[PDB]
Symmetry: C3
Subunit: 129 residues, 3 copies
């Protein structure tokens, strides 16, 4: 039934301060214009994009923390294999591609994001048929 | 099998400064008693009600992020068809009435809430039977 | 099926004030060296140990908030019967001993942990065989 769970918290200021820096895992998962507008800790860009990163991380912990997570997990093409997106109705959906996709081969991920003030959070649950 | 998951954080300080503001969605869920007590930035009733609030928020996100989001849109019929209570013993429970109780006819709602510092939080999970 | 869920936030500042203090239920569950290092609010220890404590609370509430508790009454030696071990490359897992282990006899528990800035958090999820 439940393969996994994850929870992550993220400081929006601290994230805003480090999201835009040529050579990070941010570069490999956010758009330059997304990293750039998010550089601004007072913009909604930043507040929203912190939440999306918190979902990504929550998903990582949920899998990592499972069995479906191999004993040498996590090479480092695992941040854009997991993609956290808004769906047509305004709701979060995870999109797996790549090698993680193949692990999590046949599992449903539910996710929820939230943000308040300078803090942003997410949790993700992994199910199994 | 998990049909919905929600999480939401609320700012106990901001919450308490708007819980007694007239016209709001709060007056349909808390008693004028409560709303006024929950007006002091650190008064135990603030923290507690911030949390019931977060609880509610998080059940709403779990539903509007599921398949039975089948519109009867966001009428804030939902805001008053859904209620979070602190049972006799003090355990948090969900009460559904009206429309939502019909849509979530046979689903199971699990919540938990907490509050630390200036911040309250909660999480709900929706199960298909 | 899901039997219960649990979530908990902890102020690491406040925890590292009240953790090396005498007669606290901390003493009954953490090691005198453990609590002594978690006094430095800015240390690794205090972080690391706040997330373990939120873990315990998140599992305590998951079980508590259920009908798999029997009109809950906390058994004694809880907190310390609920262990938050890790699995080498740093993977959380819960360990039960004693009464709870019996009460939660054939339950599987999922936890995740997390700590950002000065708050730490955890979530738990209790499922039937």
């Amino acid at each position: 039934g439940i393969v996994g769970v994850g929870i992550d918290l993220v400081s929006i200021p601290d994230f805003a301060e480090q999201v835009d820096q040529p050579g990070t895992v941010f570069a490999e998962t956010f758009t330059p214009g997304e990293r750039r507008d998010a550089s601004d800790k007072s913009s909604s860009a930043a507040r929203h994009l912190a939440a999306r990163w918190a979902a990504k991380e929550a998903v990582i912990k949920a899998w990592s923390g499972s069995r479906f997570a191999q004993r040498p997990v996590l090479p480092e093409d695992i941040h854009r294999d997991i993609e956290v997106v808004t769906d047509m109705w305004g709701r979060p959906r995870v999109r797996l591609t790549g090698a993680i996709a193949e692990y999590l081969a046949d599992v449903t991920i539910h996710v929820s994001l939230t943000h308040e003030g300078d803090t942003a959070a997410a949790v993700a649950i992994l199910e199994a048929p």
